[PDB]
Design a protein that fits this description.
4 copies of one chain form a homotetramer.
Chain A lengths: L14 H6 L6 H20 L5 H7 L12 E6 L1 H5 L2 H10 L5 E4 L1 H10 L5 E2 L6 H6 L2 E4 L2 E4 H25 L5 H12 L5 H7 L4 E2 L7 H12 L8 H12 L4 E6 L3 H11 L6 E5 L14 H7 L9 E3 L3 H11 L11
Parallel strand pairs in A: 1-2, 1-7, 2-6, 7-8, 8-9
Antiparallel strand pairs in A: 3-5, 4-5
Bound molecules: nicotinamide-adenine-dinucleotide (4 copies).
C-alpha cells in the first residue's frame, strides 16, 4: 500500500523528481502518474519485436507503414490544434511515435493555416460584438484574424481544383483521410502535423471533415467547380482495419466527442483496446459519451476487461506536454535512425 | 429592474405559475425563463405570414427557419419522445444529430432501453451482454435485431445507387431509414413524412457505421457523400427569412448548425442547453458570445444558454413553448 | 426492469404527469425522480406515530420542539438565500416541515436584509469595475446595492448592543444558533426564514457565522462595544444531539462545503442518516468533500449502509422548487392545524 | 501581440523551458503562466525594504502580506508537503483552512494516508474500517491515535482557560496544536514556530470537532470564540502595506480571505486555483471579477484564476515562484 506524500521542495527544484511525485500526491496528480505508467507500457509494448506468428497476422493490411507490436491511436479535439498542443502533436507524428490520428475538421485546417499566419493570445471575456467589428474570431482565450481564412482560401482553392480534376479524369475516390494526406503534402512545411503524417504514412481520420472552414471552402468551391465527393464509408473500413489487424492497441484521447468515440469504436471491432489513457474535462452525469468514464467503455468491449485504463480530469493544454515529457520524449532515441 | 422572488407554495401547487417563477428565481432558473422567452419569440416569428431550386428542397419556407440539434445520448434518453413530438407536428425545420442519435431512435422501435445506474461495473455488464449509456442499459440483442432489420435495406440502397443513379448522403439515408421503420414512435419516421431533413456528417461513428461496415464485405460499394449534405444544410440557412437555433449539448451538432448560420452572417435567435464549460477552450463549452465574434449569431440577437442537463430542462422548455402553441401547428 | 420513455406531449400539457415522467427519462431526470421518492419516504416516516419505546429514547433532548419519527436536516449554501429559493426554504420552515437548518453566514444575513431591501436580477458578465463604481455588488447573476448593507447596519447595531449587555449583565453565552434565533425574532417579518425558524423552535447552525456581512458588523461594533463572544463548541453539542437522539434522520442538502459536511458529520454520530438527497453541481474528481458522491459518505458511516441515497447533479435553483412541488407541498395538510 | 506556440520537444526535455512554454500554449496553460507572473510579483513586492498593538500580533510587517488559503482535502493530499514548505520558510503570512485541513496535518504525524481509487465501494470500505477521501484512504485507527494524542492537550486547554484566563479561539488552538505535535513534517508546527496565524472559523466541522465534543462530556467547559479571530484576521489586512491572496479551492477559505481584504478596499494581487464554475451563482465558482464588484480585489489589480485541480498545478506553481527565490528567504 502506497502512502500519500508530496514532493518536498527542501530538496530544491529537481523537476524530474517533482513530476514523479505526482503519483503519490493524490486526486488528479495520482491519475497523471497512472497515465504516465500506461503510456510507458504502450511504448514498451510497441518497441517489443514482432514474433513470426504476430508479424504474419498483422501484415494483413496493405498499409505502407511498417507494423509494430502496439498500434497507438491519438485523438484530439479541434481547439487543441488552435492551442500550442499543436506543437506537441506535431513532434509525436514527426517521429513516428503514434500510428493513427483522429481529429475533427478544425483540427485539420488550423494546422495548415498556422503555416500561413499565426494564432494570438487573447482572453475568454473579450466581447464578441467588438471582436466581430474588428474582424477577429475568438477560440477560447485565443484569437484568429479573419485574414487568416482569406489566406487559407487563396492557398486551398487551386488544390480543390486539382482534386476535382483528378476525381473526374483519373478515377480518384476521395475520402477525408485521403484529402488530409494530400493537404499535408501540399503544405510542405515541417511545422505542420499533417505534413509529417503523410510523410510517415500515418492516416488521419475525420468523418465530419465538412464541419469547419475547410467545409466553407469546399462549399463555395462547389458553385464554380461542382461535384467533389468525400466518401466516409471507405474511411470507416480503413480506420477499423487498423484496429482489427493490430497485435496490441493503445488509445491516447485528448477531449471528447467524435474523436473519442471513433477511436473507441474502431477498437471495439477487435473486442477492445489493451491500453487507454483519456485526458478530458467532461463529466459523466449528463449521460454523454464525452464524459463517460473508461469503465463505461469496458461494458461495450471498447476497452478490454483486463486493461487498466486511466482518465485524467484536466485541461490537456496543461497535462499533455507533461505526459509527453515523462513518456515518448524519454524514449526518443528508440524512434529514430 | 426586476426583484428576485421565488414561487410561494402558500399558493398551493400551480405548476404553470411555478415554472413562470423560475424567471425571477436567479442563476440558471433565470436563464430558463429567458430561454422560454427566446423560443417563444422564434415561434411567434415562424407564425408570421409570408427557392426550392436554390435549396433543392421540397419544404416550404416559413418566416423563421428553426434548426434543432441534439447529441446522441439524448435519443438514448426519454428526450427522444420530446423531440419526436416536435418533429411529428412540423414545429422545427432542420435536425442535426450524431449517428447514435439516428440509430437509437430506430432501435427503440425494435426493443427498449432500460434504466440502470452510472456506477454499474463494466466487466459484469460485458459478461452479461449489456451495454451502458450513462445510467441507461442496452442489451446486445437490441443490436442483433437492428442488424436483421437493416441488412435488406442496405441491399436496396446499394442496388439503387448502382442502377438508379442515387447519390447517397447521410440526410438521404436517414430519410430512407425513417420511411422504412414505418413506426409513429420514431423521430425519423416523422421527419421524412414532414420533409424535415436530418444532417449527420459523421454518420459512420456508431452502430449504423458498424452495420454498414459489415454489410460492405457482403455487398460492396455503398458510398455516403458529405459534400452534397454540406450544400443542403448551408442553403437552408442562406435562403431563410430568419433563423433560430435550439441546441441541446455540444460537439458536431452545435458547431454544424452554427456554421450553417455563419453563412447568412448569423442566427436571429439562439437557445443552448448544455453542461459544458468554457475554460478548456472547447467549442462545446463556448459561451454564445464567442459565436457572436465569428458571426454565427447576429450582434443584435439576444442568445441564451442554460447550464443544465437537458433531460431535466428540455421537457419543461417544450411545455412552456411549442406545446402551448399547438393549435397554430395544428 | 423499467423502460426508458419520456413524457408524450401528444397527451397535452399535464404538468403532474410530465414531472412524474422524469423518473423514466434517464440521466439527471431519473435522479430527480429518485430524489422525489426518497424525500417522500422521509415524509412518510416523519408522519408515522412514535411508539412508546421510540418516544422515550427521543424525548432525551430538552428541545421544546415536539419530536417526530424522522428528524430532517435541511442544508443550503448562502447564494441560494440570495436566490428565490429563499421563498422555498421559508415555506418549509414556516410549516414545520424540516427540523434543523444548516447554512453559512450569507445564508443568514441575506434573509434578514431581504426584509429591508430587495435583491435584483442582473447578468453574470457585468464588469466588476463599473459595478463597484456604482456601488452595486454582484452575486452570480444577481445584484445587491451597497445601500442594502447600510440598512442592515442601522437595523443590526442596536441589537448587538443589547446582546453584549445581556452577555455582560444577564450571563447569556452566545453561540451562532442562539444569535440566529434572536435575529429572526427581531426581524419580526413573515417573509423571513429565520423569523419562522425561531417561531417554530427550529435551530439554525452556522459555525463560521463571522464569514460575511454579519461578521463585518460585529467587527466594527466590537471597537465601540467590545467583548461579544460567539462560542462554536456549544453549538457542536447542540447539532450533534439532534442526530444522536433521533428515531430516524433524513438529510436534504443543497450545495456543498461546510453546510454539507456539518450535517453529514452530525449524522455520523448516530452511525448514519437513514435517507439522504443531495442537489449540487460539484464533481468528485478534485477530491473535495463538496463533490464527493453519497457513496463516499457511506464509507465513513455518515449514511447508513442500507440507505438508498440520491444525488441530483444540477443547479438547485431549477430542481429544488420542482422537488418541493412533488413532495412536501402535496402533504401540506398533514403539517398544519 | 503574443503568438500561440507550444514547447518543441525536438529541443529535448528541459523542464523549466517546458513550464515556461505554458504561457504561450493557451487555455488554462496560459492562465498558469499568468499565475506564475502574479505570484512572482507578490514575492518581489514582499522583498522590498520597509502596529503590533493594533494587530495584536508579534509577526513583523513586510512590504506584502500574503494570505494562503486551501480546502481540507488538499491537506489529505500530498499538497500538504508543498504548503508545509512555504510555511517552514516563512514565505506566506496568514493561513486559512477548514477543520480537516488542520486535523489531517496533525494525524499524518501519527499515521499515513494511503492511495486508493474514487470508485471503491463504501459498504466494503466501512466493513473494513477504512474511510475514503476522493481516491485516498484513512484507516479508522488513524483517528484512534489522534484521540489518544489530543485528549491530554484538551485537558490542559480547559485548565488554562479556567485558571489562567486564556480565551481560546480557533487560531490560538491551532497554534497550540502545532506546538504540541512538535514534528517538522507538520504545517502547523512550522506556522506557530514562525508566528504565522491560522484562521479556521468552523474549526468544529471535522474530527477535531468530534474529539472536542467527546472530550466535553469528560471535562466540560472549553469555549472557542470566533469573534476575536475575526478581529485578528481583518486587522492583518487593514494594516498591510500591500496584500496578495493565493487561494486553492473555494468555500469558507476563499471568502474569509477575500472578506478580510474587503476591509482595506481590496487585495493588490490575487491568484485562484480551483475547479468550481460560476453558473450556479456560488461564491466558490465566482470569477475574480465578481470580487472586484465588492471591493475584495482592487480595480487596478490583475487577478488570475487557473481552472484546474490544485494537486496538479500547485507544485508546479511553487517550483516556478517561491522555490526559485529561496535564497531571499533564507
Ligand atoms: N477551433 C475550434 O474549436 C473549431 C474550429 C472549426 C470547427 N470546429 C468544429 O467544432 C466541432 C466540435 O469540436 P470538437 O468535437 O473537436 O470538440 P469540442 O471543442 O466541442 O470539445 C468536445 C469536448 O472535449 C473535451 N475537451 C475540449 N477541449 C479540451 C481540453 N483542452 N482539455 C481536455 N478536454 C477537452 C471537453 O469535454 C469538450 O466538451 C467539430 O466538428 C469541429 O470541426 C471547431
Ligand atoms: N452516446 C451514445 O449514445 C452514442 C451511441 C453511438 C455513437 N455515439 C457517438 O459518440 C460521438 C460523440 O457523441 P455526441 O457528439 O453526440 O455528444 P457527447 O455525448 O460526446 O456530448 C458532447 C457534449 O454535449 C453536452 N451534452 C451531452 N449530454 C448533455 C445533456 N444531457 N444535457 C446537456 N448537455 C449535454 C456535454 O457538454 C457533452 O460533453 C458521436 O459521433 C456519436 O455518434 C454515441
Ligand atoms: N451570497 C454569497 O455567496 C455570500 C455572501 C456572504 C458570505 N458568503 C460566504 O461565502 C462562504 C462560502 O459560501 P458557501 O459555503 O455557502 O458556498 P459556495 O457558494 O462557496 O458554494 C459551495 C458549493 O456548493 C455548490 N452549490 C452552490 N450553489 C449551488 C446551486 N445553486 N446549486 C447546486 N449546488 C450549488 C457548488 O458545488 C459550490 O461550489 C460562506 O462562508 C459564506 O458565508 C457568501
Ligand atoms: N474533505 C476532507 O478531507 C474533510 C475532512 C474533515 C472535514 N471536512 C469538512 O468539510 C467542509 C468542506 O470542506 P472544504 O470547505 O475544505 O472544501 P470542499 O472540499 O467542500 O471544496 C470546496 C470547493 O473547493 C474547490 N476545490 C476542492 N478541491 C480542489 C482541488 N483539488 N483543486 C482545485 N479546487 C478544489 C472545489 O470547487 C470544491 O467544490 C469543511 O468544513 C471541512 O472541515 C472535510
Amino acid at each position: 500500500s502506497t502512502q500519500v506524500r508530496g514532493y518536498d521542495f527542501n530538496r530544491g527544484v529537481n523537476y524530474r523528481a517533482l513530476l514523479e511525485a505526482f503519483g503519490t500526491t493524490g486526486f488528479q496528480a495520482t491519475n497523471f502518474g497512472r497515465a504516465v505508467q500506461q503510456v510507458n507500457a504502450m511504448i514498451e509494448k510497441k518497441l517489443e519485436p514482432l514474433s513470426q506468428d504476430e508479424d504474419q497476422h498483422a501484415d494483413l493490411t496493405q498499409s505502407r507503414r511498417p507494423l509494430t507490436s502496439c498500434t497507438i491511436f491519438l485523438g484530439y479535439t479541434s481547439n487543441l490544434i488552435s492551442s500550442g498542443i499543436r506543437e506537441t502533436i506535431r513532434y509525436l507524428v514527426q517521429h513516428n511515435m503514434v500510428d493513427v490520428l483522429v481529429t475533427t475538421a478544425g483540427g485539420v485546417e488550423e494546422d495548415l493555416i498556422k503555416c500561413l499566419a499565426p494564432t494570438y493570445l487573447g482572453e475568454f471575456s473579450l466581447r464578441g460584438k467588438e471582436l466581430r467589428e474588428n474582424g477577429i474570431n475568438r477560440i477560447g482565450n485565443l484569437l484568429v484574424p479573419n485574414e487568416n481564412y482569406c489566406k487559407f482560401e487563396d492557398w486551398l482553392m487551386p488544390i480543390l481544383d486539382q482534386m476535382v480534376m483528378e476525381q473526374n479524369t483519373e478515377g480518384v475516390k476521395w475520402t477525408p483521410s485521403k484529402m488530409i494526406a494530400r493537404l499535408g503534402k501540399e503544405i510542405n512545411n515541417p511545422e505542420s502535423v499533417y505534413y509529417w503524417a503523410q510523410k510517415n504514412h500515418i492516416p488521419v481520420f475525420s468523418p465530419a471533415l465538412t464541419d469547419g472552414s475547410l467545409g466553407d471552402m469546399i462549399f463555395f468551391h462547389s458553385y464554380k467547380n461542382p461535384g467533389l465527393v468525400l466518401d466516409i464509408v471507405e474511411d470507416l473500413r480503413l480506420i477499423n482495419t487498423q484496429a482489427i489487424f493490430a497485435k496490441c492497441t493503445g488509445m491516447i484521447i485528448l477531449g471528447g466527442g467524435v474523436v473519442k468515440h471513433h477511436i473507441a469504436n474502431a477498437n471495439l471491432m477487435r473486442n477492445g483496446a489493451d491500453y487507454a489513457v483519456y485526458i478530458n474535462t467532461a463529466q459523466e452525469f449528463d449521460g454523454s459519451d464525452s464524459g463517460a468514464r473508461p469503465d463505461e467503455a469496458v461494458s461495450w468491449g471498447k476497452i478490454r476487461v483486463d486493461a487498466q485504463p486511466v482518465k485524467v480530469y484536466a485541461d490537456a493544454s496543461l497535462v499533455f506536454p507533461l505526459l509527453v515529457a515523462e513518456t515518448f520524449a524519454q524514449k526518443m532515441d528508440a524512434f529514430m535512425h
